[PDB]
Design a binder for this molecule. Structure first.
Ligand SMILES: O=P(O)(O)OC[C@H]1O[C@](O)(CO)[C@@H](O)[C@@H]1O
Ligand SMILES: O=P([O-])([O-])O
Ligand SMILES: [Mg+2]
Ligand SMILES: [Mg+2]
Ligand SMILES: [Tl+]
Ligand SMILES: [Tl+]
Ligand SMILES: [Tl+]
Ligand SMILES: [Tl+]
Length: 331
């Protein structure tokens, strides 16, 4: 009660013996500040009148909600002022952002300041997604610095603005969940070294796209509803906010899918600031994350707003689906 394991202490003790500049801690502390202010805004968005649109379009196709603008501004200002970043990639910005020379640090941060747009007005769970890379290059910081494979992630995670606000953070040694204490405004450790179940009993996907699904996804869903061995069918769940569906996948196990479809070769979700961070989390918790044909973290991107198909969750469920894709694979 008078010894609170906050995120800050955790990240600090973690990188102790393995010392370091400590700009990662500065990084994460900065981000926590922005997540608290996003949480506060969201918990009162109707009163504050933060519902609706801002009147702008993004890169390939999304409508800009007022909360997008607010949250994007927050995350950018605090990352910049942390002195730990040099390149920022945001879902809301067409180009990467280069931090002014005075405030530069060695990390590249890829983020979605607010994910789950369609669910904002109906008060369903939304969140913030981030991927953090070390800049390897020695040349002047640039967008190229963000075009790294997810395998190079040094830290990734999300803030879930659900019934409670939760900060899930994955680093080289594992995944830890921190819950926002609204009274003292600190993220406190509530779940340590989280591991996903090997097999779950929930499948999560938008069946509204059944007409566009590939034979592999079609066969898999059918198998979840009509199990060949007469086991109980899987329950369905699709909140519609990636951060919510993935978090449930993490703590309950199962599978989440946003696959490629007849009209979307590369799926819908964004590789840099949606799929890679969740892929990384999934794999640090002992799960898997695939496009159906290759590991998400091994893709080498060519576009910061590039899209990727993503199938993630319990290894045995992701693997059952990989087998179906392999079975269907053609010349
Ligand atoms: O309505 P759809 O096509 O299922 O989109 C849902 C997905 O869209 C997103 O809002 C991303 O744009 C994700 O949070 C969510 O998983
Ligand atoms: O807006 P989003 O993030 O895409 O959902
Ligand atoms: Mg967004
Ligand atoms: Mg998004
Ligand atoms: Tl957006
Ligand atoms: Tl959004
Ligand atoms: Tl998206
Ligand atoms: Tl998007």
């Amino acid at each position: 009660d008078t010894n609170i394991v906050t995120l800050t202490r955790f990240v600090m003790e973690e990188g102790r013996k393995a010392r370091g500049t400590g700009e990662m801690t500065q990084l994460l502390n900065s981000l926590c500040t922005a997540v608290k202010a996003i949480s506060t805004a969201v918990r009162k968005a109707g009163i504050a009148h933060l519902y609706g649109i801002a009147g702008s379009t993004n890169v390939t196709g999304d409508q800009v909600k007022k909360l997008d603008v607010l949250s994007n501004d927050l995350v950018i200002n605090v990352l910049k002022s942390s002195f730990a970043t040099c390149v920022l990639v945001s879902e809301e910005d067409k180009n990467a952002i280069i931090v002014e020379p005075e405030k530069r640090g060695k990390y590249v941060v890829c983020f979605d300041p607010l994910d789950g747009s369609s669910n904002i007005d109906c008060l369903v769970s939304i969140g913030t997604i981030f991927g953090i890379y070390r800049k390897n290059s020695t040349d002047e910081p640039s967008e190229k610095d963000a075009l790294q494979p997810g395998r190079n992630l040094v830290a990734a995670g999300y803030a879930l603005y659900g019934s409670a606000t939760m900060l899930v953070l994955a680093m080289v040694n594992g995944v830890n969940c921190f819950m926002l204490d609204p009274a003292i405004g600190e993220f406190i450790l509530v779940d340590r070294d989280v591991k996903i179940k090997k097999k779950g009993s929930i499948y999560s996907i938008n069946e509204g796209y059944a007409k566009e699904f590939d034979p592999a996804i079609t066969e898999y869903i059918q198998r979840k509803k009509f199990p060949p061995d007469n086991s109980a069918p899987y329950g369905a769940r699709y909140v519609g906010s990636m951060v919510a569906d993935v978090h449930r996948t993490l703590v309950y196990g199962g599978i989440f899918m946003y696959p490629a479809n007849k009209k979307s070769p590369k799926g819908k979700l964004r590789l840099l600031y949606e799929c890679n961070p969740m892929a990384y989390v999934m794999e640090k918790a002992g799960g898997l994350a695939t496009t159906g044909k290759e590991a998400v973290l091994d893709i080498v991107p060519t576009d910061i707003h590039q899209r990727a198909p993503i199938i993630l969750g319990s290894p045995e469920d992701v693997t059952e689906l990989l087998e179906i894709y392999q079975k269907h694979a053609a010349k």
